[model samples]
Target chain A: MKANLLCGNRNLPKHILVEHKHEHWIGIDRGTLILLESGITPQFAVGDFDSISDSERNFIQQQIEINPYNDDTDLALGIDQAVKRGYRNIDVYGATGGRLDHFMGALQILEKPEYAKMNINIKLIDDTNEIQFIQKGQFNVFPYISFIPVIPTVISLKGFKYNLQNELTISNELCGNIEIIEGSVLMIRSKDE
Target chain B: MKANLLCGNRNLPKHILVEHKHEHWIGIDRGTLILLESGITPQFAVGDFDSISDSERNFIQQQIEINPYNDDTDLALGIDQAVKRGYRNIDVYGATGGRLDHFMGALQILEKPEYAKMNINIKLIDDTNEIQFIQKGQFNVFPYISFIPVIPTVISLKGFKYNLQNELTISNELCGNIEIIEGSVLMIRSKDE
Candidate 1:
């Protein structure tokens, strides 16, 4: 499975991407271009072209400018373009490192209506955290982990040695556990929130 | 000209819903019930009725079920309900006090499609921050403030001592400013994200 990765500045997975020899790299702004010129040529490029050096922007335009649509902020549209190009499984890097707004906006975009049913498995990943989206249904979680529940959730922890059983639903709140039982799928859902 | 304020933790003018006795008082969750049962009755109330003592929930229900919709989250639907009932200009308090997800979710809900054209002046306020969504065209701003641009933007910051006089589009990135010169509009447009 060829994965299209969106790279940013914080908690970047540069090392993992390099080791995997994943082809079809797509750089966004200066942040990604810096890595590209250092001997890594992304297959496509997208961004405001403001962050990069002139030479870098020239290099990107020279390579590819397929359907360069400017309007949506770069990262969201970048992921959108990748999904359109048949890369359903996308991983985002450098998303969580800087401003709180950046991180919040990225997470919010996941729930937007555009890519709701595109067989897209887009997630923000870092060395410390691998975050994904859950719409509804049962999720099997593991032990020795911390998580905060968002909105009012009727959450039931099954395999954990300490079963939540039927604790009060936690509203759009962040509370993490130290030792969550390890397992396959950790299910969580909020009908409204 | 009635402005309902909802500040929870810290005290500030932005927290004060109305300076005079022209507006009604409304509370949500523990922020209102617990604090009010000590001899204060809010004009309106909305929540899942789980935060405070069962008795407190009874008290709030006796007051008003601002919004009874089950589809959207309580706060969002509650806000919508209030707006429909002649409370058009609403300011949210206790929205950003605790939990990153809670605060983030409130912010995210603002961009929801349902309320996009409501002409509703909704804002989330805390002691140190004030956030509101601005649509297209030139709008005035204050000084010594920070602007966190999100998705769907075609922006131009004019009259900033550091002015972006032309249309400066931001995609998947943030633009930071120290101040906005008085009497100038920050022109912005909505695109795709």
Candidate 2:
């Protein structure tokens, strides 16, 4: 089942959230209030609740509260809960916008070995770009679409502006600039980002 | 020596550029025009010139032109020249803001094995964030400062809200949120990002 997880209190692009409301909604910290304010019922809310107001905390209390004050960030805990629920396809929002540290923390969650072992596909989405983790193998690339492969183990591009038939030992080059005319695939191999 | 390269035609934060004008400037495609308009002469200009007009192209011709029509993008070529010139520190501007693909491409330049082997430090700077590469080792992290370790091999954080002394097999958590008492060091180790 697909899961939509929200973390922190960063302002999200409401238009996108409206579109994604169809999925199972999960909130983390201030994001729980955002979901409640947006009128989307959250199945579970998790975080330290430091950012939310007293009343907001009370509101979230009515829902499921799994606040943990450990080293794990709210997003990490949210992902952990999502994985535990057997949700392989997870879309995360509110992880990027506010603090640079928070954004970086959200990104690190995807690089965790346990997530990699579980083969969970979690995408961090913002208004501008969508970031996903890809494993080694042949994957089709869209024409005129751009993708940044962060720390790739072995990456090769076929039928893109810069085509690499041979497997590269390290990750290099952004693929997709010109249109893909014929058939093509973006082949990649790596255990983690 | 440090080299500051500009690619794309996006409107840059002029105030920041004014301060950086003291460094060696290189332009990629339309970025050359931006440098010229700002009264900063470009040491070299490279790109396909597809984005600029005929008049602008003529103007750039008066300067040193390293334009190449290959599978690689303009920024990639610009970085190639910077590396050839033996510039260890490269700060890139105008790489973000427009054409998401271009921004991703600019980032991919850092992941290249050649740059990593040369120990080149290339930073992508924009209005919001400054992204850099960090090698594995003990390093000092400023309080309340945010950093994301992309594709980390072994990561641990100390003197932050979340401190990890044990070697983490995968990337996880955000380092700084609260202040660290007195003076401390944020130790990290990784083969590559």
Candidate 3:
């Protein structure tokens, strides 16, 4: 199933939440309220409900609650719920620069070794960028493409303004400013500011 | 020595250009021109120099140029130059959402096992957040604290509103929303919207 998981971060671009692309919806924290306000109720409203009011809490019926003060983040739980309910492709909103920790962690979790065999696809989008994890392969390209290292790997990267040969890289390291005809092997599609 | 290496990204917070605290300064890419425009001459102006006009380039005396299209990013090369110059503490600017790849790569480079033994402290700051790679230790706190994983290691995490005991974490994963009395293993001090 396809899903749209919207979390907090009020700056979420509202236009991208598609009723067509996503068949299922999961809201997290303030995002739950956003869904209700938008006249949309997700399959399950999840997260630490600290951001919502008691009246708002009463509005939500199927709430998968978690201790607000806990280690597992709301987004992580929301995505897990999405996966558990058979969401193979997820379009995420509010996971952007507004919350770097949340976004970065999601970026990491999606690339975990356990997730590799699942063949799930996730695209985290914001105003300026659309980031997704793609397996080793060829792609047409983005205007500006950036290849970020997920784990320690070596590859002969090509078809960009800047290409690499047998570059051994580790986590968090990035190679970007790629021009036309490129690929990743976490690809970030960004627009210059 | 404490050095401030200012890089490109027109959105850099102007108020942070301090006359004190930072004992040394380096400018990277368009940041080289920015430093010159601010009437400050850095020890060396480094970058690919593609963003600056020829006249602007002529104004600077020393330029450590790099291939604009190369495996090494301008920020990584610039940070390396800073380290070679023997600056222990480095404050970096223009490394926020404006360029996710550059900032994230720098984040990865700083936390590499090679860098751990040196105990070098690097801070990447923008308008809303201050990120610095920290060692395993105790810290007072921040309004918002996020502990990002630099490597696959287990930590006895503590001193947060949400604390963890013997947590197993890896790169790209983050534990955040820490209240007062927190610490990190890579800490990001953020201001909310």
True contacts kept of each: 0.00, 0.00, 0.00
Cα lDDT of model 3 by residue, B29-88, tens digit: 778766666766677766655545666555454343433334666777777776665666
Model 3 CA lDDT for position B30: 77
Question: How many clashes would you count in candidate 3?
Answer: 0
Which residue segments of model 1 deviate by more than 4 Å? A50-56, A65-71, A139-152, A158-193, B1-193
Best model number under TM-score: 3
Which 10-residue span in candidate 1 chain A carries the lowest summed lDDT?
Answer: A184-193
Which candidate wins on lDDT? 2
By lDDT, rank the candidates, best first.
Answer: 2, 3, 1
DockQ of 1: 0.01
**Recovered share of real interface contacts in candidate 1:** 0.00
In model 3, the runs with Cα more than 4 Å from the true position are: A18-23, A50-71, A135-142, A152-158, A161-164, A168-185, B1-193
Taken over the whole model, the C-alpha lDDT of each candidate is: 0.52, 0.62, 0.60
Candidate 1 CAPRI-style tier: incorrect
Q: Using alpha carbons, what is the TM-score of model 1?
A: 0.38
lDDT tens digits, residue span A2-71, model 1: 4455555566655765664455666666546544645666767666445347775566677743445665
Give residue A13's lDDT in candidate 2 (0 to 100): 45
Residue-level lDDT tens digits of model 3 in A125-191: 7767778775554434334555675442323333322344432222122222332233335767765
